[PDB]
């Protein structure tokens, strides 16, 4: 789906994004992201020689630091950009009425189907 | 270890080195090992026998394996699963066999046929039917308390 | 004394985490609550609550 | 009655016993042959009463608990019935097996092995009982294959002995084509009548009864050895002597007849069944009479005798005249 | 504890016994004997246990349920209405099977009672089963294992509408 | 060991696809099949055709 | 459910950072108190399914299956030592992790709430015991067993991802409750066909059908122990369960197109009973009674009856109880010798009194043990196929005396007779494989007790 | 862990517990209604089980 009012260039977080609720504290995604950081710095200590679970621990807390504060961002544009969406299709909603005309709901009292019996 | 040459790879053809490798590899006499042949049934080059082999192989001869009647080194029989002792006796019959099949299947010709002269001619003795006293047991046959009672009745004789 | 052996506690842990995770997702999830066709009530009769 | 109905449910469980008691043994035991010998004394001594207050009172009654499956229009618990021949059936059995406990203690008095021995014909006697006393016919197929398959066991008691395992699957082939007999019977009367219960069966006797009388007829010729499925009764007398004894004196043997005599009002009808019947018993009856001359082993020859025995039965099943054949049965 | 009325038996036929022995009975001996060893033991021990049941108290409930609407009041898609209305029709499809338990087993106890006389005191008793379980061949029988509630329905709608159509053409 | 492996492993070399090998091939496990297939061609369309009829013995047919 | 996902991640890590001589006894206790928290899971009621969140719902099918899965874990996890004693605790810690990890999938798989994540959790479920198979086949061919495997799962189970997609958008979302409730008849159409041949064809390979089920006795015979106990049982019983999921739509068509899969399953299972009856390799043997018995299995689906349901559930779970002993047996007697063929070892009445016992056991719970749940699946098939047709029992009952037939003979080869006096290295009885033994029948006579637990949701 | 503390008491679980599918409820419901209806005199299993009345059949 096209931009969409490209005026306002690409903007990695746009003007609008703080008109809506952030993400929080241990919200899963982030956990997950940094679950990823951990056994990011965990197997880059394991490429070298170096021991596993061990004397990389400023590492450790670099890659998880920087995946959260990543994902963070991530997450922000993800929220803004769902937003966006769900009001540019309310909108057409509210622009063509006429066109999406209400279907005849009829009660199952007046709805004749076939019925193929299976023995 | 295993060697890859004793696997099978590769028909009879040809007849000096295939015998050869064949009396070689099965621990037979050169005439005594004979293909099948190959006739895209797979068998590899794998080989013939006598095919009885079971009510063969008299038991006097204390060889090593007793109940299956090998010898620890032998061709065993491509299709030896149903030859053993517990599964198929291939014996020599006291009579024959075409006398065997022909006897039993004219014997049960014949009591069948007997069975159906029966069926058109059942026994029956000088006794007349059960005058049952009450409809022949309305109400305690299929029932109908109200539906039919029916006027019927024997005179006595 | 829990120090003789930190490696056992850790499942049991892990399954009361799971089951207090499972108890908010369902408070997360706490709609139609006395909104229901066949199991209606009040708030009653202790304190305004039918499940939780 | 409380004492009517609470003998025999202890006939039923005295025989439970000795089997979980040596499985909880955890020691060295000596005198189990005498324990068991004393509580088939016991099961008797309790199943001689019920005969008399039967024949005394009548009161012909069915028990029924521990349900399960209540799932479709159905439900099926376990359940069985004191009647008139399931009834005094039962101290016959109990009786002749005394008698063969005895002879076991002769028999195999030298072989160390009598203690599985006695488990595996205990828990045959047990299965041949939970057959006979039931209803239920889903019980009566628990007790079908059980027999069978404790058949086999004792069959091939004797490890080694290529005979011995030859026999047992030859018995138990048979038996399972006396199994798709029982079940194409048992299908019928589900998909046609919502159960497989007696009552229900009685109380609804049909006119069609073609389907489920060719199922007992091929049940009946694979249970009771007979034109074109006996030639497992010799081979099945190539196991041990009192093992046969009881394999095919009482138990085992009319199984097959004493299902086409509990199913006589079922069997009422269909003139063309009972007319199969005695053409196929007086087949059995004269095959091995013929087959019966000129043999030379003494099993074999009271095999082929049996056989014939069980030929007039199916005769006596064709004429209309179920209760000979039972007497016949416990003589 | 269960409803007679809903669980018919005919009384007590008790026959007097009558001899014209002097043996004399074994039976009775054996019976007294078995009285006196046997039924005050379980009557002490049942007793002991009735008033440990007295002590106090703990009481079962019957869950016990609205009616919510129907289905055939809910619209084509409805997804609040359409559950509540097949799981009560489940419940009545369950309560329905048991019904027809219920039946056959006074079919078995009327066979059981009467003996080999099946043919006498079974006569509405088997009526009444010929009926409930026409109506259920008619009603539940053949429409699958993936049934909701709308697969029923369409046989009802169908069945009704084939006997319009049989009428229609009858009359 | 050599009887294993040449039964189990040592049959699919060597094959070639003879004239007589796969007509008894396509004979032995097509001919059965569509001979149970006929078969439930004719009992089907008879049962069904029967039930359309309504003429079945469905006094009561519960366990289906 | 959630409560038991995040358990076995926790179970991960406790085999890397248990050390030496301790990872073992930790992974087998933990593993079997999961066993205990999923013994709680039985909740469920009357008119639905136990059903917690937009995640998770388990349904009366779920739920034994679940209950299995999850119990069959700490048995496989002490049965696949004496292989891996010799070799390295990193390659020890790799092997137990993934035998962790597939577990996941398979819980994973067995709580989907839409039938995409039914999908991923289902490759997910294939991709890790490729893995457990190749990296400790223990026989020539694992690279040819494994290729196999894969080839055949992937390409029969790719267009199943492609008629899901259509189904998502054709008529909204793919989660079963409203699938449940939004179904309609798609009538004979080609595009109906196509679509329908897509979807049980992807899980007719799953099972396998006669038609492919070549891959089945290499991923048997060339596999250990471990990965043979978690293939057949919860892959081959998984792919029916899913089966059992999907059919729920495109009731219309199933009556036009139903026919040949019924006529290959059928006939397959009698050709299947007979290849069994001859072949040596042992191991082998419990693999083709796992396509007969899946075969009946397949017929019980694609006739449409409660009773027919409830009987292939039953079936389901007896074989997977039955065929992971039989499998455990065979390995016993590849642990006695190194043959793994079938007239090789012979005697063992006098050698190893109780193992008879077991043999015995296992030989009579694939002979339909006559209250056992084998006989209750089997005979309930047979009920529903003669309603569905009244001349299919020739078929049944001839399946039935040759798989009495097979069995009996499994037994006999082995276990009776002679034994052959030159083989002298067999050691006698170890208590693990009695205790495997009594982990594996006490369950199973218990289900047999009162089996309303392992009838399905229409129970 | 797999016996003394696993099997039997797993076993004393699904001895008993609430029963599936409100089985004894439905007995008892089941019993209930029966009477019910043959109080009131009308046959029980009333088919046609729902409402003719409150039906809209598509006519020919
Ligand atoms: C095996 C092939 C399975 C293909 C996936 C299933 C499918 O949609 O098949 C229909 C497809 C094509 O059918 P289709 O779905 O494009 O048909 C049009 C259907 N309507 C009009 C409803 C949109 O079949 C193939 O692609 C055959 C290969
Ligand atoms: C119908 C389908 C029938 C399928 C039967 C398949 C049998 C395969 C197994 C063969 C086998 O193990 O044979 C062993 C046994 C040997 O019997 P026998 O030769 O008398 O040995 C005496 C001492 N050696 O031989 C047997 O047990 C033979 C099997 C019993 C006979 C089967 C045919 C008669 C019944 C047909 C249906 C009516």
Redesign the interface.
């Known amino acids: 789906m096209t931009g969409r009012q490209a005026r306002a260039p690409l903007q990695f977080l746009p003007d609008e994004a703080r008109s809506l609720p952030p993400p929080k504290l241990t919200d899963p995604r982030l956990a997950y992201i940094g679950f990823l950081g951990y056994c990011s710095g965990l197997i880059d200590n394991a490429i070298r020689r170096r021991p596993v679970l061990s004397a990389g621990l400023h590492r450790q807390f670099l890659y998880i630091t920087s995946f959260v504060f990543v994902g963070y961002y991530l997450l922000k544009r993800q929220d803004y950009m769902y937003a966006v969406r769900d009001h540019d299709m309310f909108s057409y909603i509210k622009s063509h009425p006429e066109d999406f005309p209400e279907k005849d709901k009829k009660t199952y009292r007046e709805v004749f189907e076939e019925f193929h019996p299976v023995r | 270890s295993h060697i890859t040459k004793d696997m099978l790879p590769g028909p009879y053809p040809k007849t000096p080195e295939e015998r050869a490798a064949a009396a070689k590899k099965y621990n037979m006499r050169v005439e005594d090992y004979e293909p099948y042949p190959d006739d895209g049934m797979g068998y590899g080059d794998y080989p013939k026998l006598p095919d009885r082999s079971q009510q063969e192989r008299d038991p006097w001869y204390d060889w090593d394996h007793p109940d299956l009647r090998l010898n620890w080194g032998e061709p065993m029989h491509w299709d030896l699963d149903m030859y053993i002792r517990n599964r198929v006796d291939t014996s020599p019959t006291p009579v024959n066999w075409n006398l065997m099949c022909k006897h039993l299947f004219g014997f049960v010709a014949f009591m069948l046929f007997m069975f159906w002269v029966g069926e058109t001619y059942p026994t029956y003795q000088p006794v007349g039917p059960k005058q049952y006293p009450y409809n022949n047991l309305y109400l305690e046959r299929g029932g109908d308390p109200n539906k039919e009672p029916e006027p019927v009745v024997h005179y006595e004789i | 004394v829990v120090r003789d052996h930190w490696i056992h506690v850790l499942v049991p842990v892990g399954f009361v985490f799971g089951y207090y995770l499972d108890r908010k997702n369902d408070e997360k999830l706490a709609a139609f609550r006395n909104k229901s066709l066949l199991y209606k009530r009040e708030l009653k009769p202790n304190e305004e609550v039918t499940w939780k | 009655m409380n ?1 009517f109905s ?1 003998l025999t449910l202890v006939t039923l469980i005295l025989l439970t016993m000795p089997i979980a008691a040596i499985n909880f043994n955890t020691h060295k035991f000596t005198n189990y042959p005498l324990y068991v010998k004393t509580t088939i004394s016991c099961a008797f001594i309790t199943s001689m ?1 019920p005969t ?2 039967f024949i ?1 009172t009548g009161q ?3 028990i029924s608990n521990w349900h ?8 099926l618990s376990l359940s069985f019935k004191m009647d008139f021949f399931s009834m005094m059936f039962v101290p016959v059995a109990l009786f002749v097996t005394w008698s063969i406990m005895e002879f076991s203690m002769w028999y195999m008095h030298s072989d160390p092995n009598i203690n599985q021995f006695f488990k595996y014909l205990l828990l045959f006697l047990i299965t041949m009982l939970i057959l006979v006393t039931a209803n239920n016919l889903f019980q009566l ?6 027999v069978g ?1 404790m058949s ?2 004792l069959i ?1 008691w004797w ?2 002995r ?1 005979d011995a ?2 026999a047992a ?1 030859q018995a ?2 048979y038996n ?2 006396g ?2 007999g029982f ?2 019977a ?3 009367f ?6 497989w ?1 007696l ?2 069966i ?2 609804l006797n049909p006119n ?1 009864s073609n ?1 489920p009388l060719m199922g007992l007829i091929l049940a009946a010729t694979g249970k009771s050895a007979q034109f074109g499925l006996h030639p497992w009764l010799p081979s099945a007398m190539e196991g041990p002597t009192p093992v046969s004894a009881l394999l095919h004196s009482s138990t085992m043997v009319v199984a097959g007849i004493f299902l086409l005599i509990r199913f006589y009002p079922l069997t009422e009808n269909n003139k063309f069944g009972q ?1 199969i019947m005695l ?1 196929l018993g007086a ?1 059995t009856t004269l ?1 091995t009479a013929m087959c019966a001359l000129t043999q030379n082993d003494i099993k074999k020859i009271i095999a082929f005798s049996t056989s014939s025995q069980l030929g007039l039965m199916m005769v006596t099943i064709g004429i209309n005249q179920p209760h000979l054949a039972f007497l016949h049965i416990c003589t | 504890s269960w409803d007679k009325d809903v669980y018919p038996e005919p009384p007590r036929r008790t026959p007097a016994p009558s001899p014209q022995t002097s043996l004399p009975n074994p039976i009775t001996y054996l019976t007294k004997a078995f009285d006196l060893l046997v039924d005050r033991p379980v009557t002490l021990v049942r007793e002991f246990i009735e008033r440990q049941h007295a002590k106090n108290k703990y009481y079962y409930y019957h869950r016990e349920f609205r009616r919510v609407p129907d289905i055939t009041e809910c619209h084509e898609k409805d997804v609040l209405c359409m559950f509540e209305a097949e799981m009560q029709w489940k419940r009545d499809y369950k309560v329905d099977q048991e019904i027809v338990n219920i039946i056959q087993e006074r079919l078995k106890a009327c066979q059981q009672r009467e003996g080999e006389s099946h043919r006498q005191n079974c006569a509405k008793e088997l009526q009444q089963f010929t009926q409930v379980v026409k109506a259920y061949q008619d009603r539940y029988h053949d429409l699958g294992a993936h049934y909701s509630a709308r697969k029923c329905l369409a046989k009802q709608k169908q069945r009704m509408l084939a006997e319009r159509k049989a009428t229609k053409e009858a009359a | 060991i050599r009887w294993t492996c040449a039964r189990s492993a040592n049959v699919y070399p060597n094959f070639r696809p003879n004239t007589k090998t796969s007509l008894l091939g396509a004979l032995f496990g097509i001919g059965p099949l569509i001979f149970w297939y006929y078969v439930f061609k004719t009992d089907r369309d008879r049962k069904e055709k029967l039930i359309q009829e309504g003429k079945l013995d469905r006094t009561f047919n519960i366990s289906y | 459910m959630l409560k038991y996902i995040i358990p076995t991640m926790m179970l991960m890590p406790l085999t890397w950072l248990s050390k030496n001589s301790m990872i073992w006894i930790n992974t087998t206790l933990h593993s079997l108190l999961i066993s205990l928290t999923s013994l709680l899971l039985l909740n469920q009621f009357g008119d639905n399914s136990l059903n917690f969140s937009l995640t998770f719902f388990s349904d009366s099918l779920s739920t034994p299956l679940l209950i299995l899965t999850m119990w069959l874990l700490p048995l496989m996890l002490m049965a696949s030592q004496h292989h891996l004693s010799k070799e390295n605790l990193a390659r020890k810690k790799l092997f137990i992790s993934m035998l962790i990890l597939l577990q996941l999938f398979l819980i994973m798989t067995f709580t989907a709430t839409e039938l995409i994540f039914f999908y991923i959790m289902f490759e997910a479920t294939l991709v890790p015991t490729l893995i457990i198979i190749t990296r400790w086949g223990n026989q020539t061919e694992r690279l040819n067993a494994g290729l196999y495997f894969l080839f055949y799962t992937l390409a029969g189970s790719l267009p199943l991802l492609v008629a899901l997609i259509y189904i998502q958008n054709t008529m909204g979302s793919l989660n079963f409750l409203i699938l449940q409730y939004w179904v309609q008849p798609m009538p004979n159409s080609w595009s109906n066909t196509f679509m329908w041949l897509a979807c049980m064809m992807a899980f007719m390979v799953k099972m396998p059908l006669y038609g492919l089920h070549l891959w089945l006795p290499k991923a048997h015979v060339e596999a250990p122990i471990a990965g043979s106990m978690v293939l057949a049982a919860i892959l081959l019983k998984l792919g029916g369960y899913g089966m059992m999921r999907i059919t729920l739509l495109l009731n219309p068509i199933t009556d036009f197109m139903a026919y040949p899969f019924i006529m290959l399953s059928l006939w397959g299972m009698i050709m299947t009973s007979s290849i069994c009856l001859r072949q040596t390799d042992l191991k082998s043997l419990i693999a083709y009674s796992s396509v007969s018995h899946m075969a009946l299995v397949i017929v019980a689906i694609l006739i449409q009856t409660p009773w027919s349901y409830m009987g292939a559930t039953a079936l389901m779970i007896a074989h997977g109880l039955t065929s992971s002993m039989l499998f455990c047996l065979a390995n016993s007697n590849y642990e006695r010798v190194h043959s793994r063929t079938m007239i090789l070892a012979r005697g063992l009445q006098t050698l190893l009194p109780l193992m008879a016992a077991w043999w015995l056991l296992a030989s009579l719970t694939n002979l339909a043990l006559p209250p056992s749940i084998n006989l209750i699946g089997e005979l309930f098939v047979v009920m529903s196929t003669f309603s569905w047709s009244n001349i299919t029992i020739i078929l049944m009952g001839l399946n039935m005396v040759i798989t009495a037939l097979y069995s009996l003979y499994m037994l006999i080869t082995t276990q009776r007779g002679k034994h052959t006096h030159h083989i002298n290295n067999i050691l006698p009885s170890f208590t693990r494989e009695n205790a495997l033994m009594s982990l594996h029948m006490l369950p199973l006579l218990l289900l047999s007790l009162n089996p309303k637990i392992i009838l399905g949701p229409l129970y | 862990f797999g016996f003394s503390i696993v099997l039997v008491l797993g076993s004393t679980f699904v001895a008993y517990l609430p029963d599936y599918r409100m089985q004894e409820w439905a007995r008892r419901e089941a019993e209930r209604l029966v009477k019910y209806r043959e109080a009131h005199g009308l046959p029980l299993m009333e088919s046609n089980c729902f409402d003719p009345s409150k039906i809209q059949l598509p006519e020919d």
């Not at chain 4, 399960?68 to 439900?75: A, D």
């Not at chain 4, 589900?190 to 159960?195: F, H």
Request: net charge negative; aromatic share 14%.
């Open positions: 004492l609470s009463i008399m207050m005394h012909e009654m069915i399960w499956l209540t799932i479709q229009t159905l439900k197929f628990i007790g079908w294959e059980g398959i086999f066991l091939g490890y080694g290529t395992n030859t699957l138990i082939l399972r084509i199994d798709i079940i194409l048992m299908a019928w589900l998909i046609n009548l919502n159960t219960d009552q229900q009685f109380m069609d389907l007319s053409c087949m095959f």
